[PDB]
């Protein structure tokens, strides 16, 4: 279960200091680049929000909104079961809250999780939008778990540039809004 992650997060993300904190960002990001390398998205946006929560947003197909063979939505399986989206449930387990916003085929979806991965209600259709297809994940890391919940902008920029090195024609932006004015870096290549 997700309790195993909270009991021994070191066996899942290496440590719960600054290193482990930033690792949470990379887990969600890698799912976006997986999608980019599959298809399927010309930009990945990473935003450090004012409340020290992280948003990771892509322009991919959008996380599947249908029922999983186990009898709960595929969105929920990805974020609540370990054992597509490796690391997503780990991030969910170690966050105070997390929500996923999905836009698929002109309809927008959302689901919220709290207290280490407990679903708040269920997956919901919000209503039709003109927005492009994509998945957006916001989460606030659990401060009772991490030694520090204070994201380094420099560390994120260096590692996202590295993730951009992997990619052709997809643009990775980092935004810090903590932060009286929106500070940001952009990386894109090329061939
Ligand atoms: C914003 C980060 C993110 N973005 C994502 N986009 C897709 S899109 C997709 C992938 C496979 C099958 N169908 C849709 N799927 C995902 O999980 C499987 C994610 C995902 C998971 O964290």
Swiss-Prot record:
This protein's UniProt keywords: DNA-binding, Isomerase, Magnesium, Metal-binding
GO CC terms, sorted: chromosome
Molecular function via GO: ATP binding; DNA binding; DNA negative supercoiling activity; metal ion binding
GO biological process, one term: chromosome segregation
Family stated for the protein in its record: Belongs to the type II topoisomerase family. ParE type 1 subfamily.
Its biological purpose: Topoisomerase IV is essential for chromosome segregation. It relaxes supercoiled DNA. Performs the decatenation events required during the replication of a circular DNA molecule.
Subunit annotation: Heterotetramer composed of ParC and ParE.
Record's protein name: DNA topoisomerase 4 subunit B
Organism (species): Enterococcus faecalis (strain ATCC 700802 / V583)
Name of the gene this protein is made from: parE
Span covered, complete protein: 19 to 225 of 685
């Amino acid at each position: 279960g997700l309790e195993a992650v909270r009991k021994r997060p070191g066996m899942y993300i290496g440590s719960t200091d600054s290193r482990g904190l930033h690792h949470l960002v990379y887990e969600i990001v890698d799912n976006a680049v997986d999608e980019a390398l599959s298809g399927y998205g010309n930009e990945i946006n990473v935003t450090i929000q004012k409340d020290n929560s992280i948003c990771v947003a892509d322009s991919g197909r959008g996380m599947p909104t249908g029922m999983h063979a186990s009898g709960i939505p595929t969105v929920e399986v990805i974020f609540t079961v370990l054992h597509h989206g490796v690391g997503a449930s780990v991030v969910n387990a170690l966050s105070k809250w997390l929500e996923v916003h999905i836009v698929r085929d002109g309809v927008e979806y959302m689901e919220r999780f709290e207290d280490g991965g407990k679903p708040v209600g269920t997956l919901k259709k919000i209503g039709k939008t003109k927005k492009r297809n994509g998945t957006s994940v916001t989460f606030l890391p659990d401060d009772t778990i991490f030694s520090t919940t204070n994201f380094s902008y420099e560390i994120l920029a260096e590692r996202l540039r590295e993730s951009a090195f992997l990619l052709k024609g997809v643009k990775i932006t980092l935004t810090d809004e903590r932060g009286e004015e929106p500070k940001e870096e952009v990386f894109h290549y090329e061939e």
